[PDB]
Design a protein around this ligand. Structure first.
Ligand SMILES: [Ca+2]
Ligand SMILES: [Ca+2]
Lengths: 34, 34
């Protein structure tokens, strides 16, 4: 890091390219974490 | 409890009250803590 890794992760999840994450996208993050 | 659980996690992270998550907040999720 220095943000690069996270910026890419953000992007991968940020399917609808809005510079954000939403509820289903958050679902897709929180997937592994029960 | 599923669906509703996701809403809570979302909300815990979604400090700035936008119905989204941003990079720092994503930081707080991707905090495995560390
Ligand atoms: Ca998005
Ligand atoms: Ca937010």
């Amino acid at each position: 890091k220095s943000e690069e890794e996270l910026a890419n992760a953000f992007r991968i999840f940020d399917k609808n390219a809005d510079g954000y994450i939403d509820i289903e996208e958050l679902g897709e993050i929180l997937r592994a974490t029960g």
